[PDB]
């Protein structure tokens, strides 16, 4: 027996124990010590399943999210579903599932960070281009959400307004192979990468590690938070075996980007919340950064299954981090063909706001310190 709110977390623990030990804890007696902050995890459950924190449009709208400790990659909370009146033990955990499109949340990690890392751009003020534009080697246009084009704009403003053209063009300038390598360093892979991946986590396999889940995004963004080191999501701290043996898991990280890249990304993503698309997550007292995401339906889907001229989306996504924690939030419906509408598109950011409030309140929320190699200027940050 075990509490219901822990069902998702335990399922990953079970999977992670046998990955490292080769032993399934359900068939072998062992005491397993985990990274789950029980109080935080309960609060996540409170947010999903009550009225106290978030105004949901209906009871079938789904939320999946993972919260990570930015210093070690310990997953401290995870809930893959809300309102589940079907108690089969250790079911599909949507929080580690990579089969929903993470849309614009791919931009910082696939496009803009690599461009800064490999020195394609030199500052957050670099004039980038929002003009009519085709996917390289194709006649298909990269449309913006409004079908409009802003023209000559700063990098910062591009990311902040979440424009598509500058993102895709940036992926072309970094190069597909170079970008794939960058994503790998952040725990994300594709079997094959394509230019549509500048604005989509859409993939062919997703049998295993391919694409993006709240789990992988939490881990990926955590790198921005800590000056650019990636940690593997860890659910288990220590196992003690029936025969008295004990195995402790130390969490070691890998340099995923230069500290200047991290800082510059953070500095731009601060504005997403203040001046941009992320304004439902804004908190005056909390130094935090983040990126929003709204995936879209296909050509086949708009024609045949989706009937409306209202703004709709199968998936709404937020990915934010403070100095201490990283959180990726996915929202949507089980059936992708049930579209998010009006207030439903604000859930993802409001779930983030509520959880982050809880976790950061009471500490001294530290801001980020401008590192050696960068200097301030007006609204923007420049290299040396």
């Amino acid at each position: 027996n075990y509490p219901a709110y822990m069902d998702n977390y335990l399922k990953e623990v079970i999977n992670q124990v046998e990955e490292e030990t080769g032993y399934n804890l359900l068939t072998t007696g062992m005491d397993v010590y985990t990274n789950v902050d029980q109080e935080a995890q309960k609060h996540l459950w409170d947010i999903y399943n009550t009225d106290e924190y978030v105004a949901y449009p209906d009871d079938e709208l789904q939320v999946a999210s993972t919260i990570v400790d930015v210093s070690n990659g310990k997953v401290i909370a995870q809930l893959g579903a809300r309102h589940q009146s079907s108690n089969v033990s250790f079911g599909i955990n949507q929080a580690v599932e990579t089969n929903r499109d993470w849309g614009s949340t791919m931009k910082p990690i696939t496009d803009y960070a690599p461009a800064l890392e490999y020195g394609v751009y030199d500052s957050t003020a670099t004039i980038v281009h929002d003009e009519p534009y085709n996917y390289p080697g194709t006649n298909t246009p990269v449309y913006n959400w409004d079908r409009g084009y802003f023209g000559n704009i700063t990098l910062q403003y591009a990311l902040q307004q979440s424009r598509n053209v500058p993102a895709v063009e940036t992926l072309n300038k970094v190069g597909l192979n170079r970008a794939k390598t960058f994503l790998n360093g952040l725990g994300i892979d594709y079997p094959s990468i394509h230019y549509s991946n500048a604005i989509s986590s859409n993939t062919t396999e997703s049998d295993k590690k391919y694409g993006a889940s709240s789990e992988k995004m939490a881990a990926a963004y955590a790198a921005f938070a800590n000056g650019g080191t990636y940690y593997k999501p860890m659910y288990i701290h220590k196992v003690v075996f029936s025969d008295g043996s004990e195995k402790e898991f130390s969490n070691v990280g890998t340099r995923a980007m230069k500290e200047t890249t991290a800082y510059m990304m953070t500095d731009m993503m601060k504005t997403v919340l203040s001046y941009g698309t992320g304004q439902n997550a804004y908190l005056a007292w909390l130094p935090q950064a983040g990126k929003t995401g709204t995936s879209n339906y296909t050509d086949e889907e708009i024609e045949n299954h989706i009937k409306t001229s209202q703004f709709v989306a199968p998936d709404e996504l937020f990915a934010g981090y403070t100095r201490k924690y990283s959180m990726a939030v996915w929202t949507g419906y089980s059936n992708r063909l049930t579209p998010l509408v009006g207030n439903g598109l604000t859930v993802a950011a409001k779930v983030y706001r509520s959880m982050m409030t809880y976790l950061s309140e009471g500490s001294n929320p530290e801001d980020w310190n401008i590192p050696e190699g960068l200097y301030r200027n007006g609204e923007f940050v420049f290299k040396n």
Partner: peptide
């Protein structure tokens, strides 16, 4: 057969 699971504060949370 008998596996115990503890949170980050070492207090039992599941017995499987």
């Amino acid at each position: 057969t008998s596996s115990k699971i503890y949170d980050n504060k070492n207090q039992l949370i599941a017995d499987l």
